Design a protein around this ligand. Structure first.
Ligand code: A1D6S
Length: 295
């Protein structure tokens, strides 16, 4: 008891399947933080979270402290004022300028290269989990654990975006998926920044799969060896032919289209790694612009 009395909740800024997130102020120190409340900790989670506390990087939202009290587990995070969804909405008539898209993509590939080099997966990359500040930085937020825990929040409202960034190996039942799942998600987000429309906006697992298939072609053993033995693969899947990326993310230039196509390879072993993507010619002229944020 009493270990949270040091935090004044200022406003609720998120509700997940398994947690709620507040903007909060430390009453002793005055720091403004994000507090995630999880209602009850498998020791396995105790150590997954402990390793995240050591996973410190300029493009990862810092986990400041973990506090266990009552029937609750509190995670204290660095606070940022806006996420990429809100910024993309505010930017929609114009679109985010390409140099800023490129900066954000580059930074997130750096953050991913870092956490992948430590065998840590995000697992749930999406615009609302990408937080931005006034200095042009963008940071990865709310890493997903390999197994959830806690009490589902009963007031949780379904979000349309939940499946839109899921890699095809996850949708097909892969149990031991790899860092490639994050590269897929980030490529979907890259496409969305460029076009101002979600790339694959499915509302069910099969709708998501079929939206991917209708654009990239139904995968087979030619392009994805082993796909036909995946747990949820069905020979009865419709066979759609691939479309050209030129139709998928116009008016993106060939350097960007090239990189995107490698981020969206079906085969997780052919999909580009974060480290390799950082060397892609798309980033030869990368800079760090500062966005105009209305806070
Ligand atoms: C949508 N959901 C809300 C919880 C969010 N979140 C975490 O999960 C988290 C962890 N761990 C740490 C966070 C730190 N800071 C902020 N700041 C918010 C960002 C968005 N904005 S906003 C709509 O653009 O105005 C308000 C300020 N959010 C965090 C992200 C996902």
């Amino acid at each position: 008891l009493g270990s949270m009395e040091n935090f004044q909740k200022v406003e609720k800024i998120g509700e997940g399947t398994y947690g709620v997130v507040y903007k909060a102020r430390n009453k002793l120190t005055g720091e403004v933080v994000a507090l995630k409340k999880i209602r009850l900790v498998p020791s396995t989670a105790i150590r997954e979270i402990s390793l995240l506390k050591e996973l410190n990087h300029p493009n990862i939202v810092k986990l400041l402290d973990v506090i266990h009290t009552e029937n609750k587990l509190y995670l204290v995070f660095e606070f940022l004022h806006q996420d990429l969804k809100k910024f993309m909405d505010a930017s929609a008539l114009t679109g985010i300028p390409l140099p800023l898209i490129k900066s954000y993509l580059f930074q997130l590939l750096q953050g991913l290269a870092f956490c992948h080099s430590h065998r840590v997966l995000h697992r749930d990359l999406k615009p609302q989990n990408l937080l931005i500040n006034t200095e042009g930085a963008i940071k990865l937020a709310d890493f997903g654990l390999a197994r959830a825990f806690g009490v589902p929040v009963r007031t949780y409202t379904e979000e349309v975006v939940t499946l839109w960034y899921r890699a095809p190996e996850i949708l097909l039942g892969c149990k031991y998926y790899s860092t490639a799942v994050d590269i897929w998600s980030l490529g979907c987000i890259f496409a969305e920044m460029v076009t101002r429309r979600a790339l694959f906006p499915g509302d069910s697992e099969i709708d998501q799969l079929f939206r991917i298939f209708r654009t990239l072609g139904t995968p087979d053993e030619v392009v994805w060896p082993g796909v036909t033995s995946m747990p949820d693969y069905k020979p009865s899947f419709p066979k759609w032919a691939r479309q050209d990326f030129s139709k998928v993310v116009p008016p993106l230039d060939e350097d960007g289209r090239s990189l995107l196509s490698q981020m969206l390879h079906y085969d997780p072993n052919k999909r580009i790694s974060a480290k390799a993507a950082l060397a892609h010619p798309f980033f030869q002229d990368v800079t760090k612009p500062v966005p105009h944020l209305r806070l």
